[PDB]
Structures are given as C-alpha cells and as structure tokens.
Design a protein around this ligand. Structure first.
Ligand code: CL
Ligand code: CL
Ligand code: CL
Lengths: 109, 104
C-alpha cells in the first residue's frame, strides 16, 4: 500500500511523453518553416483533424507557435519554437512534476 | 536532428519497466532481499530481476551489500524515496543539458 517514487515518475513521464506524430510535425516545421494545417497534413500524410489535434497540444506545451498570414489567403500558420526554447519548456515541466511528487515523500514534519 | 527526437531517446533510457516499480516496492515494504527471493515473490525470472537490479543500482535507486555465508551473493535494498527523486532529477537534468549542447 506504500506510495512508490518510481511509480510516480512513470506517471510523470507518461504525462510528458510525445506521440511519434508530434516529433514528425515539430521536425517538419523546424526544417521547412511555418506551415498551414493543410500543408502539414499533405506533407506527412495525416488528416487535417489529427494535425489540428496535435497542434493544440504542441501549442499548449510551448513547442510550436502560430502566426498570422495575410497574403491573399488569410489564416494562421504554425512554426517550431527553437530547440533552446523547447528544451527550456520541457525542463520546467519535468521539474514541476518532480516538485509535486516530492510532496508525497517528505520526511519528518 | 531535432530536440523532440532526442528527448524521446533520452526519456526511453530514463524509463522504468513495470517490474522495476514492483521490485522497488517489494524492497521498500519488506527490506533487504536476495535476487532469488525477489524473483520468487514477484513471479519473475531471477536473471531478469538481477539485470533490472543492476540498472536500478547504477541509477542510484537501490543499494547492495555482499554477503558470504556459504555461497557469495548480494542483498539488495531500496534507497529512500528522497534519494531516488534527487538522483532522478540530477540524471534527467544532465540529459537535457547534454541535448541542449547538441544544438548550441
Ligand atoms: Cl502518432
Ligand atoms: Cl489550413
Ligand atoms: Cl546476487
């Protein structure tokens, strides 16, 4: 019945895991520059809905940003945050998770 | 080469097998044990338990003492949770820093 630091870390790693498709989207954008949902979908042979779904996650995690295009067509494209930014955000997220887990394992009072 | 791909690889290396969690739990709950005892209780291969304990030892999550009453063997025990978290934090920070340097 005892709480388990390894088990808690497993849950944290799952929460911060990446789908393979997230890696493909991020890597495509870093290489090619900002792209529309439709362009990403065609390039990677994924559905537009699935791409939108993963973009929401990557935006909230701070790994991708959006920016307006006004070039006849008007809409948003999506751009990779730079590696230094991605790694800064990931570091903050995992440290946050560890800090929460630490509260379960304090000694004394 | 991209930071998410490198994080995936690093996070795989820092991952735990479900058995690791069970091995740690057993040692924390019941105290220091021999490999054969852990394997019996968990219904795992003794070789497998042995190899996972070697991984956990290198990571700083278990310790061992040599004992020789008859045949030589190791008694493994759980490191305390705060040491586990401290070591894990150090390790994952080290990995992120290494990946940071790949790009700088
Ligand atoms: Cl996927
Ligand atoms: Cl679009
Ligand atoms: Cl042994």
């Amino acid at each position: 019945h005892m709480s388990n630091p390894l088990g808690e870390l497993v849950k944290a790693l799952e929460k911060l895991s990446f789908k393979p498709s997230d890696v493909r989207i991020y890597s495509l954008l870093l290489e090619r520059g900002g792209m529309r949902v439709s362009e990403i979908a065609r390039e990677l042979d994924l559905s537009a809905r699935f791409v939108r779904d993963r973009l929401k996650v990557l935006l909230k995690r701070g790994f991708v940003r959006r920016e307006i295009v006004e070039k006849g067509w008007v809409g948003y494209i999506y751009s990779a945050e730079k590696p230094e930014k991605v790694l800064k955000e990931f570091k903050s997220s995992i440290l946050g998770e560890i800090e929460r887990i630490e509260k379960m394992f304090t000694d004394g009072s």
